């Protein structure tokens, strides 16, 4: 047979991300002296739309501690943040929506977003619209913090990791049906070339493991083991169970 | 004690650079002028259309080298024919040669220059 569709995507020729209209990578500030010892105040300049991203972005301007100029930061805006609002980031920041604090300096049950997996990676968790992280424990002796992830998983993170108080804005987006193929087309026009999708059983055997036959059917179990090789992993990979 | 470094970035130090003092010449015989006046102005153009511009337009038409620009054409005409030049327009002919329209100042008559050169 020939190389199947999911194998061709790794070459990255026509399957790259469409990033012309992106506002920029959304990240927190670089962990510096002011962040780890006190706090620094920033000002929200505007809240703007970002192509390919459901959640809006906030432009926050900080002053440079070591030379006379302004520095621009691109944050993911939480619900309630407005233009002209002061943002406080650091170890001694207050517990208010939009402030950036270490996970070890907030009480139990705090709701946070854009959480760092490690101190200084500038935000990895709870970035999509309407998602958040719940802090459910502290380990002061081990300097660890237990959190709950949007998928439901429980993770142990360093207490020096940072996060933003609040929930990511733009929630409830996926509750509205697209209602036609045209709106699906424009959604992925600004993300990547992954739409529309052709079913494997509609193809020929040379094209897909599901292809061929005088009837349209799979012909073997669609549950594929974790140890299978490229060209075989089509269907339900390493499924623990199936059915409704 | 040590030097006080207000910056954390280290840069390549500035060191003395010496000019070249070769022990033998590069070619030892300089080449003569590759574009003199006789190589810039090749020959006048004596077509009937060109002759009309001489008597009427006070314009001299020449064939010039492909390597010459308008500065060199103006300089060559002034010393070859002892005339003042108002402006020069040039073009590349379809046969691969360059033709220059040279207009003299009001103090000069192109027809008197043409018959002195030898073409009428």
């Amino acid at each position: 047979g020939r190389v199947i569709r999911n194998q061709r995507k790794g070459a990255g020729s026509i399957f790259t991300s469409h990033t012309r209209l992106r506002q920029g990578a959304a990240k927190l500030r670089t962990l510096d002296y002011a962040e780890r010892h006190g706090y620094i105040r920033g000002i929200v300049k505007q809240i703007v739309h970002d192509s390919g991203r459901g959640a809006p972005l906030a432009k926050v301007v900080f002053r440079d501690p070591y030379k006379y100029r302004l520095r621009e930061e691109i944050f993911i805006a939480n619900e309630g943040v407005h233009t002209g609002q002061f943002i406080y980031a650091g170890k001694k920041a207050s517990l208010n929506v939009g402030n950036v604090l270490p996970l070890g300096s907030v009480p139990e049950g705090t709701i946070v977003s854009n959480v760092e997996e490690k101190p200084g990676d500038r935000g990895a968790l709870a970035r999509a619209s309407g998602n958040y992280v719940i802090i459910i424990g502290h380990n002061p002796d081990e300097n660890k913090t237990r959190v709950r992830l949007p998928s439901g998983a429980k993770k142990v993170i360093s207490s020096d990791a940072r996060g933003v108080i609040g929930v990511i804005a733009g929630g409830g987006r996926v509750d509205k049906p697209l209602l036609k193929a045209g709106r699906a087309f424009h959604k992925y026009r600004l993300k990547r070339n992954s739409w529309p999708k052709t079913r494997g059983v509609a193809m020929n055997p040379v094209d897909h493991p599901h292809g061929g036959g005088n009837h349209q059917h799979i012909g073997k179990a669609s549950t594929i083991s974790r140890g299978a090789v490229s060209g075989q992993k089509a269907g339900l990979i390493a499924a623990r169970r199936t059915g409704l | 004690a040590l030097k006080v470094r207000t910056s954390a970035t280290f840069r390549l130090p500035k060191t003395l650079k010496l000019a070249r003092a070769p022990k033998y010449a590069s070619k030892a015989v300089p080449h003569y002028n590759r574009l003199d006046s006789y190589k810039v102005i090749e020959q006048p153009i004596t077509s009937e259309t060109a002759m009309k511009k001489v008597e009427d337009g006070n314009i001299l038409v020449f064939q010039v080298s492909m390597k010459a620009n308008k500065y060199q054409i103006k300089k060559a005409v002034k010393e070859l024919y002892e005339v003042d030049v108002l402006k020069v327009n040039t073009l590349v002919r379809p046969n691969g040669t360059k033709k220059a329209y040279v207009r003299l100042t009001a103090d000069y008559d192109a027809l008197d220059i043409a018959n002195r050169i030898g073409y009428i």
Binding site: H37, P65 | V4, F10
Partner: protein, 215 residues
């Protein structure tokens, strides 16, 4: 006084721009600088075998100056005075140098005092000399500076220096230096052979270990 005023600046967090401070501790040095500094650290962090560790002991400043004072009186003839002699001569007295030359003198029991440099980068060249001198009964001293040894032999570096014969008016000085030098190197060779060097911790690790032991 009526025109000048005092306006102190606030250099706290979130306040005025920080002033220019010395950042030599944080300088991103060139690669070659870091390698030569980290090489020094690595050879101290690891355990050092006794054969190499014996070279960390060097003659102290006091008798080393007396040692070089005696050796400076037997400088080899320079090229300038070489011409005068060539253009019938007394027997010369001079310092012997050259690794192959000096080793042969030691094996023939002709060297009376041997100076050994402690900073030979291919350390294998000189590492066997303390044992060879000890086996042959020739007193030796590990001295600091291969450049300094080269100075008295009109070379950039020498890596070794030895005296085989001395003038009768300097035998008393030589004998006194041998007694002092033997007490520092030859007499203590037996126990230094059983001591491992290195194992030193870094500044931050040392304080961390002390804190853990304290509490």
């Amino acid at each position: 006084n009526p025109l000048t005023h005092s306006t102190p600046k606030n250099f706290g967090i979130g306040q005025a721009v920080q002033p220019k401070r010395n950042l030599s501790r944080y300088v991103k040095w060139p690669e070659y600088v870091r390698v030569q500094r980290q090489k020094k650290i690595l050879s101290i962090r690891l355990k050092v075998p006794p054969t190499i560790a014996q070279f960390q002991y060097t003659l102290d400043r006091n008798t080393a100056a007396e040692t070089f004072k005696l050796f400076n009186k037997y400088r080899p003839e320079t090229a300038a005075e070489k011409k005068e002699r060539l253009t019938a001569s007394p027997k010369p007295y001079a310092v012997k140098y050259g690794l192959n030359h000096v080793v042969a003198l030691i094996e023939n029991k002709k060297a009376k005092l041997v100076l050994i440099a402690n900073d030979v980068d291919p350390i294998e060249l000189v590492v066997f000399l303390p044992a060879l001198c000890k086996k042959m009964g020739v007193p030796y001293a590990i001295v600091k500076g291969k450049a300094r040894l080269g100075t008295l032999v009109n070379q950039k570096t020498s890596a070794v220096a030895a005296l085989t014969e001395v003038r009768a008016e300097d035998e008393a000085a030589l004998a006194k230096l041998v007694s002092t030098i033997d007490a520092n190197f030859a007499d203590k060779y037996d126990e230094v052979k059983k001591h491992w060097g290195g194992g030193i911790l870094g500044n931050k690790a040392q304080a961390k270990m002390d804190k853990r032991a304290k509490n």
